[PDB]
Amino acid sequence: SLSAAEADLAGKSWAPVFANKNANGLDFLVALFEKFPDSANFFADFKGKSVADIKASPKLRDVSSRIFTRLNEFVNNAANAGKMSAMLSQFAKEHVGFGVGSAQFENVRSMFPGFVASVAAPPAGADAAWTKLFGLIIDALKAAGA
Ligand code: HEM
Numbered sequence: 001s002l003s004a005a006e007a008d009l010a011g012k013s014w015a016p017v018f019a020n021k022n023a024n025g026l027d028f029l030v031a032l033f034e035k036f037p038d039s040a041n042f043f044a045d046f047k048g049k050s051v052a053d054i055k056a057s058p059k060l061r062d063v064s065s066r067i068f069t070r071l072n073e074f075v076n077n078a079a080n081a082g083k084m085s086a087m088l089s090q091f092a093k094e095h096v097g098f099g100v101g102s103a104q105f106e107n108v109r110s111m112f113p114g115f116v117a118s119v120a121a122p123p124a125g126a127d128a129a130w131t132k133l134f135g136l137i138i139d140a141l142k143a144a145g146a
C-alpha cells in the first residue's frame with residue numbers, strides 16, 4: 001500500500017478528475033487508446049475499431065465508468081494494505097482472465113500522471129503516489145501470471 005500521506009496526495013489529485021466522472025472517464029480511455037493503440041484490441045467491444053469509432057460507440061460510457069468507479073475505490077483504500085490485498089487480488093484475477101497483463105498496466109502508469117495534469121495541476125508528490133499505486137497493480141498482475 002501507500003502511506004496515509006501518499007494516499008492523501010493521490011486522492012487530492014483525483015478529486016478534480018472524478019468530479020466529472022462521465023466526461024473524464026471517457027477521455028481517459030480515449031487518451032490511452034491514442035497513446036497505446038494495441039490496448040484497444042483487448043476489449044471485445046473495441047477490437048478492430050479506430051479511436052473515432054470508439055468515441056462514437058454507445059458502449060464507451062459503460063467501459064469508462066466501470067473503470068473510474070473501480071479506480072475511485074482503489075484511491076479510497078490505498079493506504080489500507082488489508083483492503084488493497086483483496087482488491088489487487090480480485091482485480092488481477094479478473095484481468096488476466098481476459099488476456100490483459102502487467103505490460104498494459106505499465107502503459108497506463110506511463111500516461112496517467114499526464115492525464116490528471118490535463119485536468120488540474122496535481123499537488124507535489126501526487127505523481128509519485130500514482131506511480132506507486134499503479135506499481136502495486138502491475139505487481140499483482142505479474143503474480144496472477146501475466
Ligand atoms: C486503469 C485501470 C483499470 C480499471 C480500474 C479497470 C477496471 C475493470 C473492471 C472493474 C472490470 C469488470 C467490470 C464489469 O464488467 O463489471 C474490467 C473489465 C475488463 N477490463 Fe479493465 N480496468 C482497468 C484497465 C484496463 C486495461 C488497461 C485493459 C486492457 C488493456 C482492460 C481490459 C479489460 C477487459 C478486456 C475487461 C473485460 C470485459 C470487457 O471486455 O469489457 N482494463 N476492467
Ligand SMILES: [F-]
Nearest residue numbers: 063064066067
Ligand atoms: F476495463
